[PDB]
RNA sequence: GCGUUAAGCGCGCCGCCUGGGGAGUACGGCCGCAAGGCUGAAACUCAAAGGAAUUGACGGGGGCCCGCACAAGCGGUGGAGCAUGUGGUUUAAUUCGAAGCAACGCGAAGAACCUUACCAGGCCUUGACAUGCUAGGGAACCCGGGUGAAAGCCUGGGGUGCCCCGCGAGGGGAGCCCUAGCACAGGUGCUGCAUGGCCGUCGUCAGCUCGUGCCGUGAGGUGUUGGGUUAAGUCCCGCAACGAGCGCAACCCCCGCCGUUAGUUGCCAGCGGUUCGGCCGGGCACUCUAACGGGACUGCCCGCGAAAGCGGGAGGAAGGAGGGGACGACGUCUGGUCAGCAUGGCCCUUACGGCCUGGGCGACACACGUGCUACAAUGCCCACUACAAAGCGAUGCCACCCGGCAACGGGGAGCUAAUCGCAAAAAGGUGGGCCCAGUUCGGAUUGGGGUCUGCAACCCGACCCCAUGAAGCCGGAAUCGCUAGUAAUCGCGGAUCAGCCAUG
């Protein structure tokens, strides 16, 4: 057990807060809680799309919600009827009355959370783990970026023994509180147990 | 965190002195913080994922 | 490894081998004075016995080298009273986990009920919770009564609108309630040697590797070794290697000097008024406030060195990483946790599900761990009086008055808070008392009264007051922390939290 979360270790600099807004004292908790709820819905729904991150800004009964996807068309929908149900379904949950934006992902092949879920899926589809991995890695590696690295839990293949798979190219400096490394964790339910998927992606500098 | 034991949200306590915090994610009612309402675990995590505004990693 | 002292190239001749163990044993024969010797099997049995070399680990092997690791030194623990954890004892239960360092005030930043998962007793079963099905009555929901510790069981009356069709009675039908059957909830019920997740730990140790090339049949080695230097695989020079990655460093935070910005903090510092409490006028200078930014780089001089780097000096707030954080490599241990959460398999589903009251998690004659308070005059008591930082506060912090010895009650102002309150900081300083004695040291235990919180404080609360005033006169073997603003010592704050066993 080691290696702090590269994100939170960088929250001060090269990386920000998924929920930026103020309050406190007697609202925070209630308000904060409110966030887990949305993120709750957006995640169980906009999956097949590529939920990458969920920014949530606030200014008193006026939330933001800016879902990050790779295939925004799925979030949107036919002509945009589904961004009507979600946007509306979100209210039946929070009467705060908020909007909902959707920013496409510039080559999801560079979004940790995605580079992982990608892998995740493959695993659940019973795909050689060692490959999906080496595969994903090269992808990132091959789509710009100066460094990538994917890690997969144990039971790789339903092995009776809890193993670990590696693979990783370029530079990936988790200690350099400046590097600006994207992180992401994909869980992998499976007939033989649960497998965790970690993906780091290193982009430029500042 | 037996779902049943998660009945703190059952206002009706018969005697307020019977109410108790409970985690709002783990249920882990052991060591919770009022400000956030998070089982000390279900807090260090979110605080890392960055889903806890201004909750910066302390340091001095 | 051998290499014209061949284990090379050849020829002549001789001896000898043909898996290990049984065996150089049994038997036969020859030989010996004898001990024995030479020749020398098999049954049986095992899949090996074995040779050289590679990586690594290990050595009561060696050289080098770090870390309060040892030493030097200061304080302490092991003794006692108590507090807290743990074992053993024990209990109807004293739920469970954690165990050498890397368990033992650890999960539990808060067990009187709750929490609580244990125990007894009473009690409910589609259930305290989620989606959905079939038959039926009535449906939302609100308010009384009986038995009861509570739960719950039994039961009584107000009251249905909503859409469609129908003169209307009335019928159909959606959300819901209830009985019954079902899919199923639920399970802190086993398994962390099925797992994710997160953490501990060797280690903040200085290391672990990769590409290409070169060496080698090969495993692999080389680079990563060597000399020097470094906090460091940090840097220099060397070298069949040349590089590069993860780590080291730097980037980031707080403390050190300084400037810019900003002054409802701050000040007779400069000025006049004063109920001389900076109170008002006023001004942002200083203090502070919080943002940005400058600033040390062995850059500078001397000297040792090939170089790195090292000794010293100077200017400077600061010097050779200025102090401290945050940051913990490839991997180790089948390290911890299925009781935070997640999840594979197994198991329970008139019950390992759930509610309730009471009890238990708090006992002891025992042991240990981690602590507090002492055993005293480099002290202890009383009066007076001085300097701090960092946090906290609306379903809260509470000035101020009166009451009570007091805990505290009753009244009650200000504050959503740099500019009101918690607050007196204590050790300290000033006067004085005690005078070496279990003694104005020590506060345990216990009796009695009393306040508060809380539905309730017997099992189990804190606190105030009187009385009692114990063990204790500095700790056996053994053992711990600390190299500075540290150790030691003195208070103040917070989280959880009604209160509180925080001496953590
Ligand atoms: Mg659960
Ligand atoms: Mg012989
Ligand atoms: Mg014979
Ligand atoms: Mg031999
Ligand atoms: Mg050998
Ligand atoms: Mg030291
Ligand atoms: Mg010593
Ligand atoms: Mg003792
Ligand atoms: Mg140095
Ligand atoms: Mg170091
Ligand atoms: Mg570092
Ligand atoms: Mg084990
Ligand atoms: Mg206990
Ligand atoms: Zn939680």
UniProtKB/Swiss-Prot annotation, chain B:
Protein name: Small ribosomal subunit protein uS14
Known function: Binds 16S rRNA, required for the assembly of 30S particles and may also be responsible for determining the conformation of the 16S rRNA at the A site.
Keyword RNA-binding: yes
Encoding gene per record: rpsZ
Subunit structure: Part of the 30S ribosomal subunit. Contacts proteins S3 and S10.
Originating organism: Thermus thermophilus
SUPFAM superfamilies, per database record: Glucocorticoid receptor-like (DNA-binding domain)
One annotated GO molecular function: structural constituent of ribosome
High-level lineage: Bacteria, Thermotogati, Deinococcota, Deinococci, Thermales
One GO cellular component, as annotated: cytoplasm
Annotated Gene3D superfamilies: 30s Ribosomal Protein S14, Chain N
GO BP: any one term: translation
Cofactor(s) recorded in Swiss-Prot or TrEMBL: Zn(2+)
Keywords assigned: Metal-binding, Ribonucleoprotein, Ribosomal protein, RNA-binding, rRNA-binding, Zinc
Binding positions for Zn(2+) per the UniProt entry: 23, 26, 39, 42
Ribonucleoprotein in keyword set: yes
InterPro entries in the cross-refs: Ribosomal_uS14, Ribosomal_uS14_bact, Ribosomal_uS14_CS, Ribosomal_uS14_sf
